[PDB]
Structure 1
């Protein structure tokens, strides 16, 4: 993605909220079953969509 200036602290980076769900999609799937909100991975992907 393009870069832009930040108030941010030296250890912090500004992520676009839209790319995070795409990048961490397997992480969302993994922690979603742990939360018990999706019985199956198909429902996990459906509610992510």
Structure 2
């Protein structure tokens, strides 16, 4: 499957149980189509490249 990854899990008890602490780097890797669309939507990046 695309859009998927895995890494070690750990505790994080500050969480409310509708959320999971998910790392910045995996999240920026998994959400690149969304980020590209958002950047060229807000105009911070002229083309997709």
Following TM superposition, the consecutive aligned residue runs of length 4 or more in structure 1 with deviations greater than 2 angstroms are none
Alpha-carbon distance, 1:27 to partner? 0.4
Which structure carries more relative contact order (alpha carbon 8 Å, separation 6+)? 2
TM-score normalised by structure 2 residue count: 0.79
Unaligned runs of at least 5 residues, structure 1: 42-48
| CA distance in structure 1 between the partners assigned to 2:28 and 2:17 by the alignment | 24
Higher helix share: 1
Alpha-carbon distance, 1:2 to partner? 0.6
Aligned positions, number:
42
TM-score normalised by structure 1 residue count: 0.79
